[PDB]
Amino acid sequence: MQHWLDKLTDLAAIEGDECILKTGLADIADHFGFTGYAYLHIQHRHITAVTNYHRQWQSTYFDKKFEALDPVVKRARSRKHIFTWSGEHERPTLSKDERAFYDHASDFGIRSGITIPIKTANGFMSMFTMASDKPVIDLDREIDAVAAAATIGQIHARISFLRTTDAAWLDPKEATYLRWIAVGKTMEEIADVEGVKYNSVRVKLREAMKRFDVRSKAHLTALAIRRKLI
Amino acid sequence: MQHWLDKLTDLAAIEGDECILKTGLADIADHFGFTGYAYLHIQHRHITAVTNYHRQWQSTYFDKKFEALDPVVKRARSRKHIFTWSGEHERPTLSKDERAFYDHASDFGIRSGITIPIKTANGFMSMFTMASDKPVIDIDAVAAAATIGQIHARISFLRTTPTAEDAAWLDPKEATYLRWIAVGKTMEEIADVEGVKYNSVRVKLREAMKRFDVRSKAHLTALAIRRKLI
């Protein structure tokens, strides 16, 4: 199946609200075996966040303003280039409340990850993090820094529009699957790209189809497009 | 006291009206001294543009089908990293009607330029480009990508309408059958209602499909409805 960056690009083009968006993010993050994702939009110290990370970990992350201690975030600030962190392989270098920070984090599968920092509007920033419960991250091929930037930029933008610009939003799968159908792919081809069972694609769409009571994909497509659903 | 990518990053957040956006786009090109800016979203054979470029260049570029000629577009297709194009320095190298192209383009201040290509949803792409009248011109590719991703999101997601696009059409017959198709009718059903031979509907639509080069009614209707051909 296509890489998570591509899945993220594909996602950043669907409607509509934060709930949907969050759902799809989680789905992608799971798919590639990640404890969760974490999108942070930070302006000085105020901090907007869309994340998967355990509700507990978030509570304490903010309650203790870990945003200042977090080495990942610190690094995200000093450079807008994709990077990977481990906490373990990093433990030897400086760390004391840091060393302890990672530990508390570990209790929630957040041991290592990939973080893509973006220079956002008005001099601010955004960073997207795919978090792994493994000690470190070894990749067969390094992820393209330029590609990462381009997709996170699209996600950042997409997320911001939630709070800037029917409400029967199709759920992320119906949406992502339907958008392929709209570009010609056949279900089995969709399944091949998404890394899911043909029956998955098969079911998701017939259900959407039933919802609207239409007898053909073309109809679902026409219908979905006309109602600004995809 | 800024670079244009910076201003473009900001512009990406702007609200909200279509015109408001396009103006913002032009204002940034002007502020920096650019004959213009150009945003292209290459889908299939289908192209959509949002430009500052001269009203004439626009109209001709598509009529003359320079999509397939422009050495800048071609390069962007096989490259998704920021790059500059001279037009003068490029004359030595290959150039059949290419040499003609750059000259004719020079008739509108488009001599050199900076183009940034990005990968968008469903494996398509978009590219952003700033045109200068200078013979040639003299940036962080990662930063460049991060920005354009935001602009693409902002242009793309809010359904802004193009300032131009490769022309394509549907004739009355096609448009009538496709409109039924877009309502879940089967081809046999269509033939019965419009009172014609199954094979007429078949061949007609079949023909349109070949013209746009798509493998499925859905794709065809998805396309038609999106390029307002119906």
Added chain:
DNA sequence: ATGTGCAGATCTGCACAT
């Protein structure tokens, strides 16, 4: 420019166990 004719490919519609 328009059809005919067919042979896979691919959906769709149903029934049923997971």
Added chain:
DNA sequence: ATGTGCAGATCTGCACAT
């Protein structure tokens, strides 16, 4: 509440005329 199987229903892709 989903995932499986299936077969009749449609469509898509050539080949060969009109």
